[PDB]
Design a protein around this nucleic acid. Structure first.
Ligand SMILES: Cc1cn([C@H]2C[C@H](O)[C@@H](COP(=O)(O)OP(=O)(O)OP(=O)(O)O)O2)c(=O)[nH]c1=O
Ligand SMILES: [Ca+2]
Ligand SMILES: [Ca+2]
Ligand SMILES: [Ca+2]
Ligand SMILES: [Ca+2]
Length: 901
DNA sequence: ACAGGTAAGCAGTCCGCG
DNA sequence: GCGGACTGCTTACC
């Protein structure tokens, strides 16, 4: 089979590669890569290498990478450009693998692990590595086994071996409840002492050397600690065994009152799962502990136990080890669902970069663009330095705060990416410029046509319509990929709504779920069978459908992230092809396009409907417009409408039959105006919102820019079984507003849109009345803790000290001394609560690490001095007042005027 | 260093106000 | 004895 790399590193004048050969065996080699750079030369001297702009270049082979590095320096010490790929690692791959890489993941060794360290002291700082490692669970994807390393003897207590039979029993039977599906894949290994533990671990690591190393927070804790622990004991010569090439690099970076350590192991690709989740999950969590995340993604338990984790191993060792095995497993479950590793490999092998580089859009695209240029024998430009500069972006229409019964939305596809393709924007397709007229002239189709021969943009740039352009081309490949995966996703969504509509006929029968591929729209034969299935079989299918959707989502939203990131890279000084002229061409064209079609859409509707000068487009943001469909329902009036689904199907057809075509002709015209390479401004219908038939609900409302809510019935072709709320920017969508309030505010909104003002007040009085009995954790607000020290001023708030920071300082003060209470980590999330006058803490609020309960020491005080009144006003009432106010409505009734009656 | 701009809402301060 | 006019900090929408 076609070969493919595993990892690659540059060490001195050599390149170290681990790869899979034609036979599927993992090999390693050390190459004295002879790099090759370029320099401009006289037009006469002819060759095959030309820079992206069409200039001749002479190629220079170098004895070794070191000589090529010194040549780039000498070249700058002179003032001449030094073209070519300066990152010799990438050049090496590009050379070694000149073909679309087809890899086999079953050959890639993905390791997953977690360790435990008892510490009565406090949190075992990896830099110090003072306490012993008493447990290690390491899962190997090739062997598909959990290798468990237990330390039975330690200065913190000796314990009896772990029992796998006990781990398997249910909690309720005094067991640990370790999943059945992995009990057989566990290899338990007890040890008399730490040295033998650590020593046996390293030999294991030698035999099963990880290619991809993942885990939860593994990069900032596990790895560092196991490195420094092995260092402080056997010496840095042994510790370096963790690297297959015996080479490590330790970067420091210490805070104002803390020491953090960054270890890099050459020959291994570390993908901390928390970093993968932060970048690809598209979520913003109140806490990032595995428990919180595990519950959010899998709906599993809280992994409970009694006492501090510091005393867990000593009092219930059986559970301690079982909990360590389960934690490692939970990450596997989350990944089996989100599939971030697969995504990483896909992106990695597509661009020919180190796998750990998928975190860098700039690196990713540099390699993609590079490889694409190599094929046409072109030479890439040299990276230059630039000063940062602000530049304009998208346009956002100021909405009129109010309610909106029926609303319909429209939106363009991969906007910026499409704009790049339509105008043919790229570092080498620049033709020139043109005197520009105020932006509103082009919108109003009044300004003179910029060019008759070139592709143009309202910002004054012109691009060749004839040529190709590596960016436009390379950006189209990834875009087509997204197209596909988005297809499978939306299908899984639709198939999913069917199963829900079917959960209304739960047939009293014993079954087994159908065997279908949820990536495709269910066929009639299937749609036929499902109607007869049981609530049991239907649910498993719903579950499988949703897991298919999530998998699709991951695949699609992240390819979208990538292409949108190429646009951003154009606006970043570190990008080899940085250029504000191109970035601005994109955003400016966007501002024009959005408003251009606003003018248009407002015409065709004022025309058709009949009225004149009536604003149908009530809002818009970057590439979307929300059109009011009241008059479109008025010209027919609530009449020939049997049930809600009636007019929803009505509007669906109106947009799909009339509105859209109009829009297509509106953008086709603009493409002509700007004389662009090709028309790709495709704007289709999005959401259809409004209240249920004959309801007291307002259907929707806006309060300001980026702040609105709508009761949607159909979204991009999916007809929900139950109306789904679409809220944007309101408190309900923010991680900082307490969970109880998000849930409560969302119910108020739901009642406010689906039902009338009566249901809202009814629920408002109810909530206000019960608010006091909610758990403290669910009514606490959340916030990140940045620059704590900065406003320290010796344990007290400083100048302009932030509420959450303040609340932290009061915390460290209430636990000051007894080093055992969890310390708030600089840069993490924290729960925050307001304290009434007279509290023993000496302040109006207190803060503590999120995803946790406050230390049992101060917990009862804070519970007693909680200012429920401020919490209700600030987090609930104030924002509620915002929604109802803008929507012309009241939550707490009003002066009946008929009072005394 | 390591995709980008737009915009809202909360507090903290400072300053005008019989 | 605050109101609002800025400013710093968060976090969401594109
Ligand atoms: C979400 C997002 C958008 N944008 C820009 C580029 C986008 O094309 C534009 C509009 O964003 P979106 O409408 O969110 O997305 P999209 O147009 O790219 O694609 P689609 O709706 O088909 O999924 O805003 C970014 O630069 N970065 C981002 O992270
Ligand atoms: Ca743990
Ligand atoms: Ca879009
Ligand atoms: Ca769409
Ligand atoms: Ca959009």
């Amino acid at each position: 089979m076609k070969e493919f790399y595993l990892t690659v590193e540059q060490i001195g004048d050599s390149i170290f590669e681990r790869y899979i050969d034609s036979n599927g065996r993992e090999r390693t080699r050390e190459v004295e890569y002879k790099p090759s750079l370029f320099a401009h030369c006289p037009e006469s001297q002819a060759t095959k290498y030309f820079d992206i702009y069409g200039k001749p270049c002479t190629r220079k082979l170098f004895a070794n990478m070191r000589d090529a590095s010194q040549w780039i320096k000498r070249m700058e010490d002179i003032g001449l450009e030094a073209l070519g790929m300066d990152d010799f690692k990438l050049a090496y791959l590009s050379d070694t693998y000149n073909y679309e890489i087809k890899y086999d993941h079953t050959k890639i060794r993905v390791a997953n692990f977690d360790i435990e360290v008892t510490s009565p002291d406090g949190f075992p700082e990896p830099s110090q590595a003072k306490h012993p490692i008493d447990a290690i669970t390491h899962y190997d994807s090739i062997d598909d086994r959990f290798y468990v390393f237990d330390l039975l003897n330690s200065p913190y207590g000796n314990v009896e071996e772990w029992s796998i039979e006990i781990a398997a029993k249910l909690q309720e039977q005094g067991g640990d409840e370790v999943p059945s599906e992995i009990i057989d894949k566990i290899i338990y290994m007890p040890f008399d002492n730490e040295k033998e533990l650590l020593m046996e671990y390293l030999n294991f690591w030698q035999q099963k050397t990880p290619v991809i190393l993942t885990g939860w927070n593994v990069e900032s804790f596990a790895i560092p600690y196991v490195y420094n622990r092995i260092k402080n004991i056997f010496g840095e010569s042994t510790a370096k065994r963790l690297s297959p090439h015996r080479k490590t690099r330790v970067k420091v970076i210490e805070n104002m009152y803390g020491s953090r350590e960054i270890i890099t192991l050459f020959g291994i690709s570390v993908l901390d799962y928390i970093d993968l989740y932060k970048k690809f999950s598209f979520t913003n969590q109140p806490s990032y502990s595995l428990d919180y995340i595990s519950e959010f993604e899998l709906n599993v338990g809280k992994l409970k136990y009694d006492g501090p984790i510091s005393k867990l191993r000593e009092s219930n060792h059986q559970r301690y080890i079982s909990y360590n095995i389960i934690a490692v497993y939970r990450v596997l479950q989350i990944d089996a669902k989100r599939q971030f590793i697969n995504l990483s490999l896909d992106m990695g092998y597509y661009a020919k970069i180190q796998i750990q580089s998928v975190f860098s859009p700039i690196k990713t695209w540099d390699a993609i663009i590079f490889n694409s240029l190599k094929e046409q024998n072109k030479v890439i430009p040299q990276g230059r330095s630039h000063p940062v500069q602000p530049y304009p972006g998208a346009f956002v229409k100021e909405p009129i705060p109010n309610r909106y019964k029926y609303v319909m939305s429209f939106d363009l596809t991969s906007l910026y990416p499409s704009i790049i393709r339509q105008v043919n924007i790229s570092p080498e397709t620049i033709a020139g410029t043109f005197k520009v007229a105020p932006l509103h002239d082009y919108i109003n189709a009044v300004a003179e046509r910029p060019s008759d021969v070139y592709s143009c943009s309202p910002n004054g740039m012109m691009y060749y319509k004839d040529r190709d352009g590596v960016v436009p081309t390379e950006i189209t490949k990834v875009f087509n990929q997204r197209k596909e995966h988005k297809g499978y996703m939306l299908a899984a969504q639709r198939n999913g709504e069917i199963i829900k509509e079917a959960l209304h006929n739960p047939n009293l029968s014993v079954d087994e779920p159908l065997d279908v591929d949820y990536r495709f729209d269910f066929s009639d034969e299937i749609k036929e069978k499902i109607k007869k299935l049981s609530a049991k079989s239907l649910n498993e299918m719903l579950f499988r459908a949703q897991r298919t959707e999530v998998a699709g989502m991951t695949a699609q939203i992240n390819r979208k992230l990538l292409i949108n990131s190429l646009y951003g890279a154009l606006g970043n000084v570190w990008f080899r092809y940085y250029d504000l002229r191109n970035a601005t061409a994109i955003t400016t064209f966007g501002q024009m396009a959005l408003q251009w079609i606003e003018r248009k859409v407002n015409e065709y509707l004022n025309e058709v409907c009949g009225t004149e000068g009536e604003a149908f487009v009530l809002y818009g943001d970057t590439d979307s417009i929300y059109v009011s469909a009241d008059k479109i329902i008025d010209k027919v009036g609530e009449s020939k409408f049997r049930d809600t689904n009636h007019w929803v199907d009505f509007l669906d057809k109106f947009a799909r039959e009339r509105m859209e075509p109009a829009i297509d002709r509106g953008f086709r015209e603009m493409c002509e105006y700007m004389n662009n390479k090709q028309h790709l401004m495709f704007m289709d219908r999005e959401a259809i919102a409004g209240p249920p038939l004959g309801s007291k609900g307002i259907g929707g409302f806006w309060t300001g820019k980026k702040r609105y809510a709508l009761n949607v019935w159909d979204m991009e072709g999916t007809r929900y079984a139950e109306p789904k709320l679409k809220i944007m920017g309101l408190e309900t969508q923010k991680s900082s507003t307490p969970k109880a309030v998000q849930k409560a505010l969302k119910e108020c909104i739901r009642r406010m849109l689906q039902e009338g003002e009566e249901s809202l007040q009814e629920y408002f009085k109810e909530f206000e009345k019960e608010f006091r009995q909610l758990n403290y954790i669910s009514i606490a607000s959340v916030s990140s803790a940045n620059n704590i020290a900065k406003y320290d001023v010796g344990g007290f708030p400083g100048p302009k000290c932030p509420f959450h920071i303040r609340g932290i300082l009061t915390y460290n003060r209430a636990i000051k001394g007894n080093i055992d209470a969890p310390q708030v980590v600089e840069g993490e999330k924290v729960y925050v609560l307001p304290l009434r006058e007279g509290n023993p803490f000496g302040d109006k609020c207190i803060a503590w690490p999120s995803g946790t309960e406050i230390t049992d020491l101060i917990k009862d005080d804070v519970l007693h001095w909680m200012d429920y009144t401020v919490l209700l006003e600030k987090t609930f009432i104030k924002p509620l007042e915002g929604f109802t106010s803008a929507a012309k409505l009241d939550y707490e009734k009003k002066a009946s005027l008929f009072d005394m009656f």
